[PDB]
Design a protein around this ligand. Structure first.
Ligand code: HEM
Ligand code: NA
Length: 250
């Protein structure tokens, strides 16, 4: 609910901007924005507010966190981004993975998520099992996002909009296919596909369905389905809170 951002060195700021450009060109070229967003998201979602452990602090680099079940396939993102670290080694992995999320969203047409650099790489990855269970429901979402992460009900619907990008893969999570007809375009189509019900060739996890069966989550999804500026605004807000969990507080 309050931040005090470090002023990083001119050289770090220059690294960040150089990296941002390189991420644009890497991402746009290899069309892997969605997996990049997933890396940022999974790097940050592990934060627990009561224990002040986990969160966007580079730990996704430790091949132990890449071995967490929930994280199958992030090792591809981590290897894809290493050249970027090779050229700007002063950057932390913490910063580099969140900047990739931000750049993913912006390249695919989505809102401008501000970026405040300065995350340190911590040494101890969080414990496995903090991220949300795709087969679970509305109250689980509040346990993960709400009680552990400290985000709000609005953050949950808006953020669940990240599934406007990309798809599931059988070898990673078990589920298969995309949520939307245009998986390389950041728009509000995800909430439109939800409210439309199940259909062939499009995925819907039970955690997706949870948003339609809840009096708070339901109208938010309706709003975002109808109003893409509303969605882009709230998403921008939530993505930014997500990207700084435990970072630069007070
Ligand atoms: C309850 C919350 C969530 C659940 C249960 C969940 C679960 C999943 C699952 C099972 C996949 C498919 C993985 C695979 O086999 O490739 C996936 C993909 C993805 N998730 Fe979520 N996720 C959640 C929240 C989020 C959030 C908050 C974001 C971003 C802000 C996000 C971004 C993505 C993206 C971009 C992909 C596509 C990856 C690709 O195309 O390779 N997810 N998610
Ligand atoms: Na889309």
């Amino acid at each position: 609910m309050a931040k005090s951002y470090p002023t990083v060195s001119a050289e770090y700021q220059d690294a960040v901007e150089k990296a941002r450009r390189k991420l644009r060109a890497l991402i746009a070229e290899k069309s892997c924005a969605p997996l990049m967003l997933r890396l940022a998201w999974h790097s940050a979602g592990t934060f627990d507010v009561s224990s002040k452990t986990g969160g966007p602090f580079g730990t996704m680099k430790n091949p132990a966190e890449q071995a967490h079940g929930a994280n199958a396939g992030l090792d591809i993102a981590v290897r894809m981004l290493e050249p970027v670290k090779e050229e700007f080694p002063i950057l932390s992995y913490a910063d580099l993975y969140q900047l990739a999320g931000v750049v993913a969203v912006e390249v695919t047409g989505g809102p401008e998520v501000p970026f405040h650099p300065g995350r340190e790489d911590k040494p101890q990855p969080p414990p496995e099992g903090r991220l949300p269970d795709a087969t679970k429901g509305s109250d689980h979402l509040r346990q993960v996002f709400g009680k552990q992460m400290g985000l709000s009900d609005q953050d949950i619907v808006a953020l669940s909009g990240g599934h406007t990008l990309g798809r599931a893969h059988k070898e990673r999570s078990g589920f298969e296919g995309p949520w939307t007809r245009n998986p390389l375009v950041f728009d509000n189509s995800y909430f439109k596909e939800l409210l439309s019900g199940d259909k062939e060739g499009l995925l819907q996890l039970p955690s997706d369905k949870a948003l339609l069966s809840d009096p708070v989550f339901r109208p938010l999804a309706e709003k975002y389905a109808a109003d893409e500026d509303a969605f882009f605004d709230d998403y921008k807000e939530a993505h930014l809170k997500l990207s700084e969990l435990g970072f630069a507080d007070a």
